[PDB]
Design a protein around this ligand. Sequence first.
Ligand SMILES: NC(=O)C1=CN([C@@H]2O[C@H](COP(=O)(O)OP(=O)(O)OC[C@H]3O[C@@H](n4cnc5c(N)ncnc54)[C@H](O)[C@@H]3O)[C@@H](O)[C@H]2O)C=CC1
Ligand SMILES: Cc1cc2nc3c(=O)[nH]c(=O)nc-3n(C[C@H](O)[C@H](O)[C@H](O)COP(=O)(O)O)c2cc1C
Ligand code: SF4
Ligand code: SF4
Ligand code: SF4
Ligand code: SF4
Ligand code: FES
Ligand code: FES
Lengths: 156, 442, 90, 226
Amino acid sequence: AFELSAAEREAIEHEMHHYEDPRAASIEALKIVQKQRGWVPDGAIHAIADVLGIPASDVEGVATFYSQIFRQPVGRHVIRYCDSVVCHINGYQGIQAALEKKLNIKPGQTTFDGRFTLLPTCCLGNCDKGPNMMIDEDTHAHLTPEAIPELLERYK
Amino acid sequence: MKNIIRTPETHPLTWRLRDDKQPVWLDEYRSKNGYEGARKALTGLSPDEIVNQVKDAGLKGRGGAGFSTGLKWSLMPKDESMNIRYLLCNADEMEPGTYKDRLLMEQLPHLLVEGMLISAFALKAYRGYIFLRGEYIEAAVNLRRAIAEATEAGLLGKNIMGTGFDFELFVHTGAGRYICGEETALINSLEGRRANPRSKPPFPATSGAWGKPTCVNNVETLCNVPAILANGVEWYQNISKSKDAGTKLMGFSGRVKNPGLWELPFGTTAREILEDYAGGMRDGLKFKAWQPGGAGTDFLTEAHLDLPMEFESIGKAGSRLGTALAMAVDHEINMVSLVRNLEEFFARESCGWCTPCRDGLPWSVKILRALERGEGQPGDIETLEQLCRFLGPGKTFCAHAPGAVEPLQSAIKYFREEFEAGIKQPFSNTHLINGIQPNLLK
Amino acid sequence: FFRINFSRCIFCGLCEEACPTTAIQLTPDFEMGEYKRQDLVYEKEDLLISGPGKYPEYNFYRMAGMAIDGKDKGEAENEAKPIDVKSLLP
Amino acid sequence: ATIHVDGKEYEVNGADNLLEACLSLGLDIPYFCWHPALGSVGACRQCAVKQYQNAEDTRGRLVMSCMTPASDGTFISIDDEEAKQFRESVVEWLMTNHPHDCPVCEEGGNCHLQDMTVMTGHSFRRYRFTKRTHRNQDLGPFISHEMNRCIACYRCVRYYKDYAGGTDLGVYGAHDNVYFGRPEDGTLESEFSGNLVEICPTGVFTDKTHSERYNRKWDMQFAPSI
Ligand SMILES: NC(=O)C1=CN([C@@H]2O[C@H](COP(=O)(O)OP(=O)(O)OC[C@H]3O[C@@H](n4cnc5c(N)ncnc54)[C@H](O)[C@@H]3O)[C@@H](O)[C@H]2O)C=CC1
Ligand SMILES: Cc1cc2nc3c(=O)[nH]c(=O)nc-3n(C[C@H](O)[C@H](O)[C@H](O)COP(=O)(O)O)c2cc1C
Ligand code: SF4
Ligand code: SF4
Ligand code: SF4
Ligand code: SF4
Ligand code: FES
Ligand code: FES
């Protein structure tokens, strides 16, 4: 059902070189599989556990403990808008309303075309330039609710 | 205050920043007196001499708690059979309202690399890990590039500066949990486990990463180290006439005219930060509250704005200095909704290990949602106060929940009117059962 | 099965007081004389009436968290829906 | 070692923690996460006593008796009002999400959580909000799984992983949605998986074979056998 690619296995083993215990590469292995496939599927837990020599219970517990290791399928781009206190003061709620009214989804949902997945995140460490958003790898600061329909059109 | 000249004597952390906010690379860094402290350390100082020098300089932990770094370094064991030591840089920085490490590792990554080199030589640590949050993409890129440049230039790897000291530096990008910044939970996450914290004692100085001795230090502390070792102890104690030596990255955020981050000596009052550096509040906004050091600290009022930003002065005011990145709450911000947002963050960033945080922060979140909707009932404010009391220091496994309930108790103490205005319904958690007469407690 | 030895029962009502579903009830009826003492042992077919008795609405299984037919997880009173441990939300 | 519990002097083992020392003296301290065979971790935060610096100390500090050594000259109070209040609070926080399941729970009458709820003195609910719920797993023919009743005390994973060496039981998730079970549906593989029905202080892990023909503990006729 699930088969790790050769590049994934080589990256996992090269990560395992860096640590005293091969269990210490579990987060990086999950991130490698997630970067290759968008999310970590069910058979990936057993594949990573077989590569690392630790039980699949611990790999599953690590994958479900960390919020940025997606254990459910996501869209092609994961929008992550900041929830925290400074972006609350600067008005992230307008940004959230603009994103919901443009994508027609609630947070934690995916659009019908699979293009975007809306997610609230914790503080992005960019509080003096808030409100802040993170599309897949790019941080967008100084957000305004009128800039959302233009900023979501450069992520096809 | 636009007229900020950043001399190396008064601004040791940010004097070599560039105007265009591009990172300073290895040639530019060494041009501006780079790796001089590392050279002095590795060519003319014993590791215990560096530990004593850092202890005499009075360098405290810039991660919020303010513990002395020399005392932390001196607590590593003296046994020579333990030589698999680890030095960890806590680059997680997940606290809401904290953005200093992002600036430090995006624009001066070689400063962090040199500080880790000096600290690893002092601690006799054979390996070093930068535990960095997974959202700092540019910080990760710049740190990996700076590590590659320092390795190619002979500043990392085997036989550094001809001394024979071997030090390997890695960058470990996390997967997004706030509790991973806790040092024992940082160690647990570095080992590839669920980032539940550990009870202390044993401290990581004797039993840390993979059982080996480990020293966890913040980004800013290790950025403070090379200036200490390149200019001396006397310069570091003669830049501020306060009990907290050295300079600190402070700054005000949130509906001020100039939100940002500036390197200031300790003893600088929060009022002059807010008015001269942050420019005061914006047009048509009135200052009603502020948090001195991030999301985990007590709210303070306008009367507390004249206190010097020190550990002892803010500690006597009922709050903590924290990360010293203050956040200003204007009059338009409802305190109940703000504290609801804070407690929602703190509740969902719980690790689930211990009962008071795991099952007593959601209760406060639901109470604050009810008070925000105008659906509060009598008993709610007293339940919030008892939650603040029984989630204090020593009642939970780690310090996530005491810092969680600090804004809650400070807001109930100062702005009790908004919480009391949330209460509108009579108390009831029981429906009527037809054939049974209820016991009417008075 | 369910049986009550009515030749032993003192009609004290402690069972009804102890019932946490209000299934067992003592009803206002006293005509229970019998020819044989063995016929005073009432099985479930002699005890299960076709209605709720003195408590017309209470349903214990509407309040219990255990899933039965017609009440899945999270469908009982004062219960949130089960959040999956693989959820994207933090 | 010499300890003073509520002004009464006791002679204990100084290599023990205060919870096991005080349980050995017949003193009652509520506890969930500690087991005599599994050791102390300090998860559930139930075993709080109040420690004083010396005899002439009045303010004290709440310490956790399972993580505190029973050293010489120790001064603790179990029946302090603040310690009693905090232990009742811990039981209350556990009770906020607990299902209304005791009549249809195989652990009833044999439940450590029932005992400690009664012992702390907590019988009045002031929580009006919703309870979290969990889906159950199929753990095979012997163990029945009911994750609603869990109090997140970590005894199952500590036993099954650190003690019994099994590999297919773990803890998944975070803040208040922690889930104790297998990574997928299937039979528990360890030969000592049955001891989960006595390690777990609630009705999460129960004897399925007994659940087929269930009777409460007070109704059993017991004998000591081999
Ligand atoms: N992003 C950030 O910078 C965040 C900062 N914080 C701050 O962190 C602090 C809470 O952190 P904690 O881990 O509870 O700090 P702590 O007070 O327990 O100790 C801080 C440091 O000193 C060491 N230490 C303390 N006492 C020691 C002893 N007796 N022996 C050996 N080492 C000892 C610890 O190992 C640790 O490295 C607060 O001040 C809070 O403001 C909290 C959350 C996020
Ligand atoms: C819940 C919690 C989260 C923390 N997160 C961080 C963090 O993200 N970054 C950090 O440097 N320290 C964090 N700390 C503080 C660390 O425990 C520790 O004090 C620090 O990382 C290193 O000490 P230092 O100040 O001497 O550098 C956190 C503490 C707690 C209790
Ligand atoms: S206070 Fe308790 S549950 Fe909360 S993060 Fe710390 S150890 Fe985990
Ligand atoms: S408890 Fe019920 S069955 Fe037993 S004697 Fe009393 S009324 Fe009769
Ligand atoms: S685990 Fe205990 S308290 Fe919970 S429903 Fe079962 S018997 Fe009742
Ligand atoms: S399933 Fe049982 S033993 Fe495991 S944490 Fe929950 S209550 Fe404790
Ligand atoms: S509060 Fe949103 S970036 Fe920090
Ligand atoms: S028994 Fe001591 S904290 Fe759980």
